[PDB]
Structure formats: structure tokens, C-alpha cells
Amino acid sequence: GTSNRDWWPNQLDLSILHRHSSLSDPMGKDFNYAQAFEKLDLAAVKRDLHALMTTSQDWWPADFGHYGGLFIRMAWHSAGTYRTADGRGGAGEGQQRFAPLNSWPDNANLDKARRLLWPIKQKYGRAISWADLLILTGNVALESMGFKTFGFAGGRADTWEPEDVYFGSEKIWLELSGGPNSRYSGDRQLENPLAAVQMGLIYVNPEGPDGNPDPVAAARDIRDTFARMAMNDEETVALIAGGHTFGKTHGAGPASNVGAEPEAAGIEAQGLGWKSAYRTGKGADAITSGLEVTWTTTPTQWSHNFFENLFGYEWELTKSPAGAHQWVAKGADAVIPDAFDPSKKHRPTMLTTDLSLRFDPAYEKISRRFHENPEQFADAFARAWFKLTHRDMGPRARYLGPEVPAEVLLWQDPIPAVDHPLIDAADAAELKAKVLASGLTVSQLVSTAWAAASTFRGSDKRGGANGARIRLAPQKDWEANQPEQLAAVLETLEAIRTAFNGAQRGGKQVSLADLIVLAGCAGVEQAAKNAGHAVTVPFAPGRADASQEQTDVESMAVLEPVADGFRNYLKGKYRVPAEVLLVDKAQLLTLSAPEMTVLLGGLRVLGANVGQSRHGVFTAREQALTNDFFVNLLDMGTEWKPTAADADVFEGRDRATGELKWTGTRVDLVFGSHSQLRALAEVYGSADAQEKFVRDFVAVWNKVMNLDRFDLA
Amino acid sequence: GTSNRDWWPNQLDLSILHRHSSLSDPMGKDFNYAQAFEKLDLAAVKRDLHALMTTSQDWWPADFGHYGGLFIRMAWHSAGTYRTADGRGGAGEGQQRFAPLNSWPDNANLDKARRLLWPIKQKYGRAISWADLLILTGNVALESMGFKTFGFAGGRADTWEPEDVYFGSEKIWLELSGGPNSRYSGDRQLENPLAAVQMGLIYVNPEGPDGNPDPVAAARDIRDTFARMAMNDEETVALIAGGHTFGKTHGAGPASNVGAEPEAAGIEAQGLGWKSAYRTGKGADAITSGLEVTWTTTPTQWSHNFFENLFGYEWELTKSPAGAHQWVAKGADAVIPDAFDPSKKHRPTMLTTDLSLRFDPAYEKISRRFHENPEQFADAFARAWFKLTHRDMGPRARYLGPEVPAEVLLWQDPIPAVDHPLIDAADAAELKAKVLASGLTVSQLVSTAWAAASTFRGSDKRGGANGARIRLAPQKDWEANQPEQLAAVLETLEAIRTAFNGAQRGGKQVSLADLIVLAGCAGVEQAAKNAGHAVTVPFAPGRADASQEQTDVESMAVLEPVADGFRNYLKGKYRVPAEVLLVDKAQLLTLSAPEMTVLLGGLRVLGANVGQSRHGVFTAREQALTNDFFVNLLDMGTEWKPTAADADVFEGRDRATGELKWTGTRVDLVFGSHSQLRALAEVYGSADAQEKFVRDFVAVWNKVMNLDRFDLA
Numbered sequence A, B: 001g002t003s004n005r006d007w008w009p010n011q012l013d014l015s016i017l018h019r020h021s022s023l024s025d026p027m028g029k030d031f032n033y034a035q036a037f038e039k040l041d042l043a044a045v046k047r048d049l050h051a052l053m054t055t056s057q058d059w060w061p062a063d064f065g066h067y068g069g070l071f072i073r074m075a076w077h078s079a080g081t082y083r084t085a086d087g088r089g090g091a092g093e094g095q096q097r098f099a100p101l102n103s104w105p106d107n108a109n110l111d112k113a114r115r116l117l118w119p120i121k122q123k124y125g126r127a128i129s130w131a132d133l134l135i136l137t138g139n140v141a142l143e144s145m146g147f148k149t150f151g152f153a154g155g156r157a158d159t160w161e162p163e164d165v166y167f168g169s170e171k172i173w174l175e176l177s178g179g180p181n182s183r184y185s186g187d188r189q190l191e192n193p194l195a196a197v198q199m200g201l202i203y204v205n206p207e208g209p210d211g212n213p214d215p216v217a218a219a220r221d222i223r224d225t226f227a228r229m230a231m232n233d234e235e236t237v238a239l240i241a242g243g244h245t246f247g248k249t250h251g252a253g254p255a256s257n258v259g260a261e262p263e264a265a266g267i268e269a270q271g272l273g274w275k276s277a278y279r280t281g282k283g284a285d286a287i288t289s290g291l292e293v294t295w296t297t298t299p300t301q302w303s304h305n306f307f308e309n310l311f312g313y314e315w316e317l318t319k320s321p322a323g324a325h326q327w328v329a330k331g332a333d334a335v336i337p338d339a340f341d342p343s344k345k346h347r348p349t350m351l352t353t354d355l356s357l358r359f360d361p362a363y364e365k366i367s368r369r370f371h372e373n374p375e376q377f378a379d380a381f382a383r384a385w386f387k388l389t390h391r392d393m394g395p396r397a398r399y400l401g402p403e404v405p406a407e408v409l410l411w412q413d414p415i416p417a418v419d420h421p422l423i424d425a426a427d428a429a430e431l432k433a434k435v436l437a438s439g440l441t442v443s444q445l446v447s448t449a450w451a452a453a454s455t456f457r458g459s460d461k462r463g464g465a466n467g468a469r470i471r472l473a474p475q476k477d478w479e480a481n482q483p484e485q486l487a488a489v490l491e492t493l494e495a496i497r498t499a500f501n502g503a504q505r506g507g508k509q510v511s512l513a514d515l516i517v518l519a520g521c522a523g524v525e526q527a528a529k530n531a532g533h534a535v536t537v538p539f540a541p542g543r544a545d546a547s548q549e550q551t552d553v554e555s556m557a558v559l560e561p562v563a564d565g566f567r568n569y570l571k572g573k574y575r576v577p578a579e580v581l582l583v584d585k586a587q588l589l590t591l592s593a594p595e596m597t598v599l600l601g602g603l604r605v606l607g608a609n610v611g612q613s614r615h616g617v618f619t620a621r622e623q624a625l626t627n628d629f630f631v632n633l634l635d636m637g638t639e640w641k642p643t644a645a646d647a648d649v650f651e652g653r654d655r656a657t658g659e660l661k662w663t664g665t666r667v668d669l670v671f672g673s674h675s676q677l678r679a680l681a682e683v684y685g686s687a688d689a690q691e692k693f694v695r696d697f698v699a700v701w702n703k704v705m706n707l708d709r710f711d712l713a
């Protein structure tokens, strides 16, 4: 059956904005996962999970009698899809149970691990999500095997369909670099936003870069990919050595014995895959990665044996029974237990990427420290594991249940608690009047609040106006934020703030974070008034101001907008067309297509463009909130053509006279081109739509202003 | 960007069940189109449209100074995608303005026609849909040129995204038959559910079958395709001759002058396409089909000159300036006006498919009658035009506005007016008790009501339990309806009805259509009781009983279920997997994936399977409403394998012992295989879900029972 995607493969795809509708969700519209989880007996779940660890099922027998290693890998993979570039991936949506992740080569036999968990899921039902359960199971596996974890938070609501996530353009699983859809260019530069070296891997190739078993070169790919997943050198060494303290790999026979991945398997396989024709196809005979490495002398107990082995032997390159490159310890005795046969033992073995931890000079120093100081290793691993598994959960207000760590961590972008009375409706009116009397313009107020609030992305729930981090490094210096204009607005607002706070009694004060947002609302109210509409914009106080020292400048760098179609901004020239980047941004902001449409048309006429560009400013009454953008965009009296100078900029000329009327960008004109977008523009460009436009614009403005307000949830 | 669709191109696609979410709709949740339309000044819209007919725009100059012909083609194409096999296509959702239809070859330059309508759309806004406006514009064109139409109904609400519609498997536009994805097999048998001869055509090729200019052969394709669009010979001749009384075709130069269709054009084209490099690219120079035919001496006035020409000349095969086969009148005077030059005239011309109306024997007799009696021609065309343009609108209760024809037409599947008091809640409870006391079983009651209600399809809003047509030919003898069991149930219900109606005073009575639905509700309530749960199933009275004489038996044939996964029924062996046919049925029933999942699991345990098959009956308490289907489906203690006898039937055996527990079909086991469906099954198979299951089942049951109840809208 030929589809629109087949006919017009490069056309813009809006269906990513209409994922996660109430249609696909089996839970009622009023279902609140947090409330369900708060009533969960978490301690009872943990007991059940502890019992599961050593209750082997014959259809996938437990290595060494203990599933712990398998479940730690499961949880690590759930979390390890995360990318700092867009915040997409991670454990926070339980997407491991959907395509494509349920069927990635690197997730082979984690279908078994998830199926082991079904009885527990079934028992507790809606009170624990799959997303929470995968991580909790990893925690309990660690605990069972003698490692005390740093904490756990619930609150990852299940999702009910696959995410639309760009994982790369290769058409072959595991394709090596330099092919027709290569994710590498230049001096092994990995394309943004990707964080894995090959399609279907979590981070790197365990044999080495493109399969070449050079631990030094592997270490470069590790560093790069783990950095792109928010981990530094210390964290990376702690995690890899920590993980590989447990369990084993599986490569008992050739990989050609392994059949279809879950999404390709027969209906009778009931959601499982990689069925193996090698011997019993499981347990002693299992084939997962194709490697056959067991790292420690006690694979089901926390130990200090990973680094004893790493440093205590010299390593010889060898092959697994499936033909994969791996390393074996020169001259060693057979001291590593077999997973199934008590009369067999093995020599110590390592992956190429384990050897990275010794033969990369920077990792070597960390590895030695952790070798000599195992309590530092233990602490670093506990902290990194918590971080890995909670990275995408958002503000601490979202963390549920009785094991949430009290320690506030820098990577959480923390926001101070509010310790004083908030401003009320009268105070808000008074502050808005002051803001409008200062001389700040509609354009300045709307631009500044948009800049502050629109850093939020729902993928990892980072960013937003809470914290007033727009006044700090690096946000205050971002080109899109118009640093010089921004400094002047913040100075005026700081003065208004100081004078209001000065005049209060009791504890009462207003944060700059709130006043930024409030002042934007005032700008919108004023724009509406300029257009003859009497409008109040909703405002919710309670934001607090974070310090510079509470704001990791390096980690904040990934939130910088290099494309923001809502401000007609593009920082450079990219391969992806700007209207694809607009829809991507709308998705991160949680906007539907109608919300995207209304927001953009409003912001254009309010003066939110970077540099006060005229592109898409299709009105003769700028800073008045009207539907002019739509009425003028859709006017057939104007003809559009790309410019000689720049084929990404378009001139709109009167059809009859040739006179230039407007200019616009791809982002502006797509609303008059794309057949679904133009249908939405038509609604808002109709003669009956002025009040609808205004009211819908106010609603989406407010929604953006509140995106990070999990304190009000 | 590689997607799930690319990795697993044969997996089941559920997103068709989640179109038309509130997310993609720009209108508020309370928007009621009917209410907006009922306040439209229709007469003022018509005056505006009348003026538009003769107000030429220089970007697409009007042929002969009148756009009427263009708009009649536009409306005919809006309606002419319709297929009786599934009720998909037609004008009723305004889908011409979205992909792929906005860009089909046969819809070339109707982008111009829709753009001409923007000013009027913009003026009246939400009070007239695009879907209504396309048809109304066709009507006003006809009216303006002297043709009295039969009527017009409003009520087609706009839609906001493209439908998912199978239009064929060819990967090349207009591909001639016999390709690798040929829609023809055997002796030119067109595959169901298609109703056109080539990909991107409305019905047939105007040059002749696969381009071969033989009017006799062409007539075979005309008859076939028009029959698949619900039109008999008389209707077909009336429509084609009627339409081709007006306007002209466009083929002024070679077709290689024509550029990209709208979905492939540059952003600057602002939603238009087929930009032509031939001379001015428009007006006298236009290229649309590549044919250059003008049928009558008065293309802007209703006449009987199509038939005067068709019969009054002999016809010679010739070529247009674009190279297309067409016909010219031998030895004729130049009597046909030119569209732009008043000093030029032309000989009469015809399409191959116009000559079909003379050289097919059966068409010839109709065409002669219409030639000799143009008043019969006018009436037949008006009736056929109404039918064409309203075929997919559903029950007459949906028809809005002041021009709805009073005459009731057989093709409308009419339902008699109710002229008496309805039963109340006490009466309903009394009837449910009587039904349960008769000895009719849960299985019988549920199966009968399902059979009655589940003929509804939202594609053309035909079918449903209103009418009690299940008691008439042909429904009463459809194999899926279990004719012998059905007859016994209907007899018992008719006796209950007669006794209830006999005992009433004051005109109150219950229709059999209502009692069938009510009896099913009693079944579901009793099943719940059997499971230990007291529930009330909602029930709305007001259905009426249609007669055999009010039921077109041939037209009812397309509503026969040949696949109904909800009753585990497949009438034969098909190329399309049964789970794909399930999802197709769910879509026609307007179900989401969760609704589909709940409905199916309940029906299996209530005994709704045709022939009392045990397939998928995963319970030991049949005729109790429980979630046993899900709990048992998802039990990892059961292993599934296809049978030796039949690869589409599966045995579930205990994993440990090999004991046979269950059997199932692909439709049953897909819920344990497909990763999105299994996630939904999990929810309903959890230990906290019995009350949720019952409540959601009751809700979707009620929704199905009410699908055709536009009398309650």
C-alpha cells in the first residue's frame, strides 16, 4: 500500500506533534501516575524483585543462578539511549518495550529480562510503571549482589506508543562508518544529535571502533559518546568498571544461529525474539553479543576484582566462539567460575573497551585511583548510576517515593526552595503596571520572557524560566537571546524588583524568575490592548532564582538554541531544512500543530524576531496582537520567490504591480505551503477568527510560561 | 532518518486508529460544526459564489470568462474518490485539500479552483467547511449556467489531516496495468477495494484502457468503476454527459512543460502545483490532462448539445497538441467557441470515454433516450449529481440547511420517522428482565446485537443497528450472522416485543431495532452479574424499523462482513493477514487501539465467536464478563505454535507438561505479539484491572451500539 511518505519522502512530518494523544492511551483522562505510585507499597515490590533474582525460569535460565547481571544491563540500556543534544532517549518513558529499541541488536535478550518482570508488573498494575520498574529492578539487582545504591525516585509515567526519534540514517543494522548514510565525517566527528557509533548500539562497539580491536582508539569513542550522554571521565570509568563487576557476556556459538529480532519474529514468539538454533539456545548456550567474557571471580557479588584483573594481568587478543575480538589474560590460572557447570573454570577475559580504561592515559589515572581506593570507586559508581538512571526525570519536584536522595546534585539544575510569601493578584497588577511604566516595549518584554521560558524541552524536562538562569552564564551570552538587549531589560527588571522587595513587609518578595515571566505577560496584555482587545494573561508565581554556582555552564550549553523558528533564528547553515527544525522544537516544547501555528503567528507580530528581522513580520501594526500574520500570509494578491542572494529567503511581491510587500524565511512560508499547516493558518486567517486567535495565543503563551512548573503539579 | 516503518515494513500499523485526535484539531473541543452551519447565511454564500463564477483572476484566467466548468470538475473529483467496497473516499471530509488527493494527476489544477475559493472561505469562516463549500460551489456553478439542481445538504465537518487510505500498491503515478504491483488480475478484474483503473485517476483513463483508444473497451472500465462507486448505467451516462455539457479540457502543449505536483513543489509555490513552462502557463495556454476537447457550442450554459454532437457526427481519431488520443468530428464546421479568442472557432471534439456512451450497446440505448428526451436527461443528472455528492454523508438526520430535498431516496437506506412515545428507563429495565427470562443466553444476545450494530462504517456512515435491517434480506442470511441461530433469536425477541407493545396505553411502543440493542445490553449486564459485578449498560431508545421495500438489497451487499476479527470470522482465505483486517475493521468502527483491545477481549469471553469457535476463548467461565482473555493470553506458562493442519491457527500448550490448553487465531495472538497491542493487553491483564475492564468494555459496547445514532446528535 503506497503512502504519502512513499510519494513525498522529504515532506514535513507533523504526526510527531500528535503522538501521545488520549486516543492511544488506555488510562483514563484523569489518570494521575504520581498519585498511583505514591500509594504503591514500594518495599513489597522490592521484596518480590529480590526473590525474582534467584528464581530461574527454564525458558531463559539464570547465569550463576542469579539474574542480577542481566537486569543491571537491562536498566543500563534503558537509560543509555539518552542524548544530551536533544534530551531524547533515556529510561524516563520506558521506550525499551517499544520499537525500535525493543529490537536493537544491543538490546538482544533484554526481551527475556522484561518478560521475567511481567508477573511483578501484573501484580502491582498501574501503581508501578514499566519505566520505573526497569530501573528499580536494576537497583534491586545491585542491592541483592551487595552494592548499596545512592537512591531511587519513582514518577516515570508509562507511554503507549513509540517515540519518533532520529537515531540515524543508516538502512543497515550496525553498519560500519563511511557508508552512504555515515554518521561520521571529518576526523571521526559524530553527527548531532547522535550518541552512538553504529545504528543499534547503545554507545560504542565492544570489539573497538568499527570492529578494530585498538583499546586506545576505542577510548576516544567511549569518551565522545559518554560525553554526549552527560558523563565525564570519572563517571564513565566508574560506570563501565562498576557494570562489568557483575555478570557475563554471551557468545557461545556463531551468530548465524540467532534468528529474527522481536519486531520481525513470528506471531507465535509472543513478543520475544533472537531465538537461537545453537544447542539449547539459552543458558550455557546463550548468544547475545557474540562475545564470551566473564570479568570477575565472583560475578554475582560486588567486589574489587575488575581492577585487580585489569591491572594484574597482561592481555592477549583472541576470538570468542562466535568469532568476535576479545582479550584473555596471559599466563593466568582458570579462576573465573562457569555460569552453569561447577566443574569448569576460566581465565580472566576483557573486552577491548574494558582495556580502554587502562590504556587511555586519562582513564588510566582514574582506574588506578579506583584500584587503590575502592571506596572512592564505590561512591563514584553509586552517584553515576543514580545520575544515569535519573538524568531525564526533570526537576526534583517530580521525584517520588521514600528512597529519593536528599543530596541536591549540580547536574539536576537545582532550584532553591521558596521560603517566603508569594506575590498575590494585587501585587501582580502593581508589578505589571510598573513594568509598563518603565518604558520597556512589547517586543522587549515578549522576547525576554520567550527567551527565558522556551529553553524547556519535554524530552528530559530540562530548561524553562524557573531559576532565572537567563541572567547567568551561559544563557545571558547566547546569540539567540540578544545579549545586549537582554542586559538592558534585566537591568530595568532588577531595579523594579529591588524597589518592590524593598517596600514589602513580612517575608514577601518576588523572584526575578517570576518577574521576567510576569513582565512578558504584561507585554502580551499591552499588545492585546494595542489591538483593541481587553485581555488578562494568567500568571502563576513561585519560581525561584538559582545561583551561578547552581548552574553548570558546560551542561547548559546543550540547551542553546541553534535554531528557533519562533524567533526566526538560525545560528548557521544546516543540512536539515529549517521547517524540520521548527517542528522538532515544537515537539520539545510539547506543542501540537495548532499550538505551534498560533504561537508563531503571534510572536511574529509582537516583535519577537532576533535582531528585529522583518522576515515574517506580516503586519503594519507591530506590537499589536492580531492575526495579521495569517491574513497576509494567505493573501493570493502576493506572489513569492526565493531571492538571488539567498534561496532560503523569499520575497513577496504584489502580483499585479511587482511591488515588494514582505520578505520571509522557510519557517514563515511553510505555513502557506504545507497542506496541513496551511489548513490551520486558514482557521486563524478567517474573518471570524480575531478573538479566537487572541485567546488561543494567550493559552499557548501561558502553557510555555509554565512548562517547567512541576512544583504546581 | 530511518523509521520503524523502514525496519519492519510489514508490521501492523496502528496509527490509523489514532488519526483525528483533538491534538491536530484547531477548533475547540466544544466546537459543533452543525450549530455553526445552521446559522450560516447560505443564500449570501451562494450570491458570493455566483459572482465569483464570472470574476476572472489573472493568475488563472477563466475559460470563456466563466469558472463554472472548472468548479463542476472540482466537486465531481471531491466526490468521485468514493468506493462502495469500504465507503472510503468521497467528498464528505474535504480530503481533496490534503495529500495525496491534492496532488493526484487527475486533480491537476483543482489547486487553482480551491484557491479561487479562499476569499469566500475566509469571509464565512467556521460556519462553512471546505468540505461543504466544494460541493456547494459545484451546485452554484450548475445553477448559474441554467441547471436546476435537486438539492444540497450541509453538515460535512472539516478534517485536519490526511486520511489513511489504500489507493493501490503501485509506486509510479498512472502506471499502466500488468506491472509488478498491478491492480488487475484474471480477465481484467480490479482488486477490491479499488475503484479506479490507474494510480491517481478518479475512475478511468480518458484515452481508453491503458491508453488504447477503443470506446467499446473503455465502456467496460467505465461500467466497472462507476459500479464500484455506487452508480448504475443510467446514472453513469447521466453524470458523464451532464458534466461534459460544460467547460473544456486543457492540453495546449506538451506535458513535459508541466512541473511538480503540489506536495513536491517548492515552498514558494504556496500550496499550488503543476506550474507550466508552456507559453503563459495558464488560460489559453493551460495544460491539465493534456487533452484538448471542448464538447458543446455553449460551454457555459446547460444544453442538450453533448448528445446532439455525439449522435450528429462521425468521429475521427486524432491527437492533442500534447500527444493524447482524442476524437474530432469528421467534416464538421467550426462551431465550438474558443475559450479566449472571440474570432476563433473549433470543430466538435470528444474523448474516447465520451464515445463509449454511443458505442457501448447498453449505454447507447440510454444516451438515445436522453437525446430524444432531454428533460429525462436533466432529471436523471440532477438525481445522480445529488447522490454522487451526498453518497457518504450518512443518515438524513445529518443533512443540514434549507435546501435538503424532501424526497426520500432508496440509496439513503432510509429509516422511518418515529411517531409515538418512546420507552422510558422503567420500561427498559422491564424489557431487559423479560429478555433474560425468555431463556436467551448471554452469547445469543451479545452476538445478535453485535451483528446488528457492527455493520456501521464511519467512512460513509452506512450501517448500524438503526432500521433493524438484520431481520431483512440480505443481512439475515449472511454467514457471519449465523442465519439459523439469528432467526431463533429474532423470533423470541419479536414475541417479547408484541407482548410489550400489546400491553401499552397511549401509543407507547418499542421497535425491534431498539429491542435488539436493548437485549444485547441485557446480555452484557447478565455477563457482568455472572462475574459477580452489578452494572447498568446505557441504552438510548429511538431507533425505528425499516421495511424490505425500503432496503436496496444489492447496495447492502458491500456491508457484508467477510472478515470480522471481533467474532474471530474470516469468510475465506485472503492475501491480507487477518490482523491487518482487524485493524481495518476497528478503523471503520471508529475505535482506538485501546477500544479495539477491550472490545475484543470481552467479546471472546461472552461467546460472540461465529459458530461458537473456541479460538481465543481463553476462559473457563464463558458468558461471564471478565478479563480472562488478557490474563491467559499473557501467561508465560503457555507456549504457542502454529498447527500442522493450519499455519493460521495456534495451539497453546503448557510449557512444562505439553498439555493443550487453548487454541487461537492470528487475530487472538497478535495481542500477545505486537509490541503496542501487548502493552494494552498488559493493562487489562493486570491484577488491579477487573473493574477497569468492565467499565471500559461497557463504554465501548455502548459506543458501538450508538454509532449510527445521528438522531441524538
Ligand code: HEM
Binding pocket: A063, A068, A069, A070, A071, A072, A073, A076, A203, A204, A205, A206, A222, A239, A240, A242, A243, A244, A246, A247, A248, A249, A250, A251, A287, A288, A289, A290, A291, A351, A353
Ligand atoms: C563502553 C561501554 C560498554 C560496552 C562496550 C559494554 C559492552 C557490553 C557487552 C558486549 C556485554 C555483553 C552482552 C551479552 O552478550 O550478553 C555487556 C554486558 C554487561 N554490561 Fe556492559 N558495556 C558497556 C558499559 C556498561 C555500563 C555503563 C554498565 C552498567 C553500569 C554495564 C553493565 C553490563 C552488565 C551488568 C553486563 C552483563 C549482562 C549479563 O550478565 O547478562 N555495561 N556489556
Ligand code: HEM
Binding pocket: B063, B068, B069, B070, B071, B072, B073, B076, B203, B204, B205, B206, B222, B239, B240, B242, B243, B244, B246, B247, B248, B249, B250, B251, B287, B288, B289, B290, B291, B353
Ligand atoms: C468516464 C468518466 C470521466 C472521464 C474519463 C472524464 C475525463 C475528463 C477529462 C480528461 C477532463 C479534462 C481535464 C482537463 O484537462 O482540464 C474532464 C473535464 C471535465 N469533466 Fe470529466 N470525466 C469523466 C466524468 C465526469 C463527470 C462524472 C463529471 C461531472 C458530473 C465531469 C465533469 C467534467 C467537467 C465539468 C470538466 C471541465 C473542466 C473545466 O472546464 O475546467 N466529468 N473530464
Ligand SMILES: NNC(=O)c1ccncc1
Binding pocket: A088, A089, A163, A164, A165, A457, A458, A459, A587, A588, A589, A590
Ligand atoms: N522524542 N520525545 C520527545 O521529544 C518528547 C517527549 C515528551 N515530551 C516532549 C518531547
Ligand SMILES: NNC(=O)c1ccncc1
Binding pocket: B088, B089, B163, B164, B165, B457, B458, B459, B587, B588, B589, B590
Ligand atoms: N479512511 N477513513 C475511514 O475509513 C474512516 C473515517 C472516519 N471514521 C471511520 C472510518
Ligand SMILES: [Cl-]
Binding pocket: A088, A089, A090, A093, A095, A163, A165
Ligand atoms: Cl525518546
Ligand SMILES: [Cl-]
Binding pocket: B088, B089, B090, B095, B163, B165
Ligand atoms: Cl477517506
Ligand code: NA
Binding pocket: A087, A088, A089, A090, A092, A392, A458, A459, A460
Ligand atoms: Na528523554
Ligand code: NA
Binding pocket: B087, B088, B089, B090, B092, B392, B458, B459, B460
Ligand atoms: Na468516505
